[model samples]
Target: ESPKEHDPFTYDYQSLQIGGLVIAGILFILGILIVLSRRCRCKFNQQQRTGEPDEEEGTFRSSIRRLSTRRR
Candidate 1:
């Protein structure tokens, strides 16, 4: 007759319940925080607005006058 061997990998109920609950709770809280803060707007117009159709390529000399007026 062959005897059955106990394998730790079979899983434990307490460890499964406790660890699963903890991980799920952490993920839920993290998701809520991201959703709340992700929409925050920066007051600075930091990125150079390069999509303007009027601004010509290569040299800044042509747009220099218009750029100065905009900064004011």
Candidate 2:
């Protein structure tokens, strides 16, 4: 007996198509985010070159005291 050919429009095939679309959408969003971050970095570098201080740079300060211990 010969095996039957699989149908192309089965539920399995449709699910695979949906999965591929979701994956492509995620990758597309990731690529856009990467591009936007790169552009922001370039703008930051340009601001630095122009001697402008970025406010976000000084949002955190290292003024916390540390404990010092001596061992004999």
Candidate 3:
């Protein structure tokens, strides 16, 4: 009796579908996270540039700039 032929095409097709779905999901999540982080950074940078930031740490940086102008 002749042995049955095994088809690997179907296996590879299913695997490709699963891989595409996983990759799409990862890219979507990463895009969202990057947008959020950039928004936070832009807010902080705007505050810093204005010289009226809400964070106390920013004041130290302003002081350093002032000190640089003062010779000794």
Candidate 4:
């Protein structure tokens, strides 16, 4: 008996379910918002920038455009 009187991992099952859903929804929406807001922060609102240093951009959008046009 080393005085281990309480288990911190104890749960009422209901609280676990409630917290699970709550935390799950928060992270779910956070991920979705990350992508959508991420898009807005990228090319949608700002100018495309290829750094004069090591930065790179473009090619992907134009590649798809050429492929789709060729398919059509």
**Candidate whose lDDT is highest:** 3
Candidate 1: Cα lDDT at 6: 50
Q: Rate the local accuracy (lDDT) of all candidates.
A: 0.50, 0.54, 0.59, 0.54
RMSD of each: 16.3, 10.3, 10.9, 7.7
Model 1 clash pairs are none
lDDT of 3 by residue, 1-72 (tens): 423225545355757757889999899899897576554444456644553334334334445668778886
- Residue range 10-34, candidate 1, lDDT tens digits: 4456477578899999998998974
Ranked candidates (lDDT, high to low)? 3, 4, 2, 1
Better of 3 and 4 by lDDT: 3
Q: After superposing candidate 3, which stretches have Cα over 4 Å from the reference?
A: 1-12, 46-72
lDDT of 2 by residue, 1-72 (tens): 323335544445767867889999999999998676554444455554664435453312222212233343
TM-score of 2: 0.45
Tens-place lDDT digits, model 4, residues 10-58: 5456467578799999998999975654444355323553323121432
